[PDB]
Design an enzyme around this catalytic site. Structure first.
Site, PDB file in Angstrom:
ATOM      1  CB  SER A   1      -0.957   0.029   1.191  1.00 13.56           C
ATOM      2  OG  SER A   1      -1.996  -0.916   0.999  1.00 13.56           O
TER       3      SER A   1
ATOM      4  CB  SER B   1      -4.443   1.386   3.823  1.00 13.48           C
ATOM      5  OG  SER B   1      -3.328   1.022   3.027  1.00 13.48           O
TER       6      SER B   1
HETATM    7  B1  LIG Z   1      -2.008  -2.003   1.959  1.00 15.45           B
HETATM    8  O1  LIG Z   1      -0.801  -2.622   1.978  1.00 15.45           O
HETATM    9  O2  LIG Z   1      -2.456  -1.577   3.351  1.00 15.45           O
HETATM   10  C1  LIG Z   1      -3.578  -2.387   3.620  1.00 15.45           C
HETATM   11  C2  LIG Z   1      -4.012  -3.012   2.401  1.00 15.45           C
HETATM   12  C3  LIG Z   1      -4.381  -4.543   2.690  1.00 15.45           C
HETATM   13  O3  LIG Z   1      -4.685  -5.202   1.491  1.00 15.45           O
HETATM   14  O4  LIG Z   1      -3.011  -2.908   1.472  1.00 15.45           O
END
Ligand SMILES: *[B@@]1([O])O[C][C]([C][O])O1
EC number: 3.5.2.6
Length: 261
Positions: A43, A103
């Site tokens: 993310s 996120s």
């Molecule tokens: B990013 O990495 O932060 C949370 C999401 C989980 O799929 O992706």
């Protein structure tokens, strides 16, 4: 140096692979640990998608207020904010905020769509001088974090330089840069990562990432009180596909870096 010895020791104690890049903007000095190795971004890539949309908004002045429909088919595996707006709309600003501060994976996919696909995100990186970043997939598959797979990776050095340009430099317009900084400072997912290794009085803007192979990432801009800001990227991944997240490693790496200044 002392800091590199301590980061190597932290890595050895963790069982995984640690990548760190620090830029101290006071003297443009850099501290690197596996700085040119590729790591899965997970993310942390959401910063690039949001920044790319912000860059578009410099010419399309009202773009961020454009409503975007959230449909049930849009929902993927982790959509804390988009879930609240299914069968409704979110503006591109709200989607950018959700992608960065929560996120949200649906939000990220909408940003990618706005940019014309992963190649549009990558193109923005190239346009601001980042030859290393590559976004290849959408959510959730960009988090597979398979060892050796170059898809959806960058290096710590590259991401630190790019994050500096986006937040402290002038890759974006003045209003866009300020908006990005505001979004990063309001992140809600970072309390156990870089922030946890730093003095509570320092101001931090960060974006975490998590994925398979216990991949645990955080990229941050740091404003120490009475001191030039710092850019700190901490990437961590592990050899077991089902490994647990290790945010404590990122906190510890931040603490080691902070001690050396
Ligand atoms: B990013 O990495 O932060 C949370 C999401 C989980 O799929 O992706």
């Amino acid at each position: 140096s002392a800091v590199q010895q301590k980061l190597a020791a932290l890595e050895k104690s963790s069982g995984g692979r640690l990548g760190v890049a620090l830029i101290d903007t006071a003297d443009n000095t850099q501290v690197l640990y596996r700085g040119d190795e590729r790591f899965p971004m997970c993310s942390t890539s959401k910063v690039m998608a949001a920044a790319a949309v912000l860059k578009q908004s410099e010419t399309q002045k009202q773009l961020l207020n454009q409503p975007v429909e959230i449909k049930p088919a849009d929902l993927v595996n982790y959509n804390p904010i988009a879930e609240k707006h299914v069968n409704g709309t979110m503006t591109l600003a709200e989607l950018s905020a959700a992608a960065l501060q929560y996120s949200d994976n649906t939000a990220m996919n909408k940003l990618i769509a706005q940019l014309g696909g992963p190649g549009g995100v990558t193109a923005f990186a190239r346009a601001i001088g980042d030859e290393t970043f590559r976004l290849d997939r959408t959510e959730p598959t960009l988090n597979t974090a398979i060892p050796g797979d170059p898809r959806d990776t960058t290096t710590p050095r590259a991401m630190a330089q790019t994050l500096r340009q986006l937040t402290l430099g002038h890759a974006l317009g003045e209003t866009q840069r300020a908006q990005l900084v505001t979004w990063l400072k309001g992140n809600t997912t970072g309390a156990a990562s870089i922030r946890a290794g730093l003095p509570t009085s320092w101001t931090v803007g960060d974006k975490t990432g998590s994925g398979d192979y216990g991949t645990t990432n955080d990229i941050a801009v740091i404003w120490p009180q009475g001191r030039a800001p710092l850019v700190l990227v901490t990437y961590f991944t592990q050899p077991q596909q089902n490994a647990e997240s290790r945010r404590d490693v990122l906190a510890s790496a931040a603490r080691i870096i902070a001690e050396g200044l």
